[PDB]
Amino acid sequence: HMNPIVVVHGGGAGPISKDRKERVHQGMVRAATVGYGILREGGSAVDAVEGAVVALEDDPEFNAGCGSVLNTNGEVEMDASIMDGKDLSAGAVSAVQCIANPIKLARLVMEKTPHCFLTDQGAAQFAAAMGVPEIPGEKLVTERNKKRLEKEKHTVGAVALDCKGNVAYATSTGGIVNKMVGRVGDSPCLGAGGYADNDIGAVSTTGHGESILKVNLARLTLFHIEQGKTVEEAADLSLGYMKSRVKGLGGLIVVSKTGDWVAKWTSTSMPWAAAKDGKLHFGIDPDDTTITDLP
Amino acid sequence: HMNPIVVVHGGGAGPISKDRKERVHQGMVRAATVGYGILREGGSAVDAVEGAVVALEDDPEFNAGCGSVLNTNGEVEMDASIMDGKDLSAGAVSAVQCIANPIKLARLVMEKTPHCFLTDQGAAQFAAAMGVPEIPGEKLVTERNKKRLEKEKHTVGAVALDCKGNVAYATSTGGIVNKMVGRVGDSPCLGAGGYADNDIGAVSTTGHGESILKVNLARLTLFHIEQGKTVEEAADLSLGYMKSRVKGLGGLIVVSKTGDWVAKWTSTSMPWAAAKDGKLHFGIDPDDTTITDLP
Ligand code: NA
Ligand code: NA
């Protein structure tokens, strides 16, 4: 059987202030912990990516769930997607409002409907039918995200390979500050925000959503693995192309079908954590990687 | 400079009546002739594909715009996308209601916003701001589609090469009958419903939306072409993969950057037309195609 693994990311960002880096560090550790605990007890790859991303959705420090960036009207509209590498089954939602966990709604879509993608009002109606609670929009809005919008005017992901050799990705976001109402980015679109395939691996992406969509970044990365590039070579070429062709920045996490993994980015930073062989691997800036024991 | 070509499809289907067959025929002719007419003036591939699809949207015989299938609530919800292969510029709309031409709105997303994808309420607000008429909902509902919805309760596209060497695709659809509220197919999702890249070619797809999304059909087709496979080989490989892996049948059209083109499908039938060099090709069933001179 396969030694399991989970990689998590807290999105592409520019420079991060001293004190924020600590709470971001705290957030990543817990997310990878939730995911690795699931894998260490024979939970599936899908269960693991879902668990890790709920933690980041629940933590107001991250642009997904509580703490999502606000649209051009000071409201939170969220996108999410999840994918099962075994049969390529998938679920996704876009521009969802007044719910706590977008990623959980995407897994409902995957397992419970005959569809792969629901949006906006239809996503709300399915949620309520699934008994997903309705939370006031203000429970998702932070004070820092109010400040960010008022100044602009004037993502999170996980991959996992489980003990059976199944792979999975999940991605969840509030989008991009000052976005038009109903703007949908890459995060709920398979092949762009993420892709999972047992015969190759699983990728989750972050960064400029419009660019990620244009180059199909997640699927693109896996293409290169199929050519015989390493996970790191594949990440370099795909992000390189998004930079060269459309002038877009971001980052990605990937795991191969055989357990190889990397976190690479072309923006300044990308908080990432990994857990494989009882250890925790963490970083934010290039080559700041710390390795700790994860009992 | 290249000889322009426009290829159009009127969506995969099971067996079709001989009467409707001819009604579909003339509409395919209408669309391809509009798109070719656009290229004849030396117009862009984006202009041509938008023209071909608008014509199919207005046509009641095809499942896009007027004549879109009904969702569970007896309503019309539409998806469309458009991509410019030169710079990968793209525009898409999902779950749009009560407007004539979703493909026209997708282009407005592409050329009049920094976003690539709008959905539901946000797209409809953007439709108001661009002065798009909010027409009556019942006008898109056809009697034929009501019967199909009662029974279940008991896609169109175009690729072009222009004389400047540019490629584009446009796809539009009402989705599938009795679909859940806010269900999103492949049609508006870049890499699935279509892809256009001046350095490879362009593709527009049709068939079971969830299957097309899961395997990213349009982009997979183009991966084979990059790998040196012929347009037909490539379409047969991607369709072949979709059938075995996720048990979905579909169809596509593809035009390479060197002007080579094909329509292939694994559904029972796919009405299609291609206009090139003063000849209009047309088929619905495999093998039998009529070629006639174009004035
Ligand atoms: Na959060
Ligand atoms: Na129509």
SS (HEC) of B200-268? CEEEEEEECHHHHHHHCHHHHHHHHHHCCCCHHHHHHHHHHHHHHHHCCCEEEEEEECCCCEEEEECCC
Tokens of B8: 């159009």
Which residue of B84, B108, B115 is the best one to mutate when testing the A interface, meaning the one whose CB has the most A CBs within 10 A?
B115
Q: Give the separation between CA A282 and CA A272, rounded to whole angstroms.
A: 6
How far is residue A85 from each of residues A195, A238, B59, B179, B223, measured CA to CA in Å?
Answer: 8, 20, 40, 25, 20
Identify which of A209, A205, A139 has the alpha carbon closest to the alpha carbon of residue A180: A209
- Is A116 in CB contact (< 8 Å) with chain B? yes
Q: Compute CA A230 distance to the chain's CA centroid, rounded to the nearest angstrom.
A: 22
Q: Which residues, in sequence order, are CB contacts of A227 under 8 Å at separation 6+?
A: none
Q: How far apart are CA A144 and CA A102, in angstroms?
A: 21
Two tokens at A217? 């970044």
Say how many residues make up chain A: 295
Can you tell me the distance from the alpha carbon of A294 to that of A6, in angstroms, rounded to the nearest whole number?
13
8 Å CB contact of A119 and B119:
yes
CA B174 – ligand 2 centroid, Å: 9
Furthest C-alpha separation in chain B: 56
Tokens of A74: 């000071």
Give Cβ neighbours of residue A81 (< 8 Å, ≥ 6 apart): A90, A91, A92, A93, A106, A169, A170, A171, A172, A187, A188, A189, A190, A193, A194
Token output for A4: 């399991």
Count: domains in chain B: 1
Q: Say if strands B194-197 and B167-173 run parallel, antiparallel, or are unpaired.
A: unpaired
SS3 category, B108: helix
* Residue showing tokens 């009697």: B143
Axis crossing angle, helix A231-246 with helix A217-227, rounded to the nearest 10:
130
Distance from C-alpha of B237 to C-alpha of B226, rounded to nearest angstrom: 13
CB-nearest partner of A121 from B120, B125, B191: B120
Q: Does the CA dihedral A228-A233-A234-A237 come out positive or negative?
A: negative
Instruction: Give residue A169's domain range.
Output: 1-295
CA pseudo-torsion sign B37, B41, B42, B43 = negative
Q: Give chain B's length.
A: 295
Closest CB from B125, B190, B219 relative to A181:
B125
The order of strands in the sheet holding A194-197 is A194-197, A201-207, A250-256, A261-265
- Please state how this structure was obtained: X-ray
Resolution (A): 1.9
What would the two tokens of residue B50 be?
């938008």
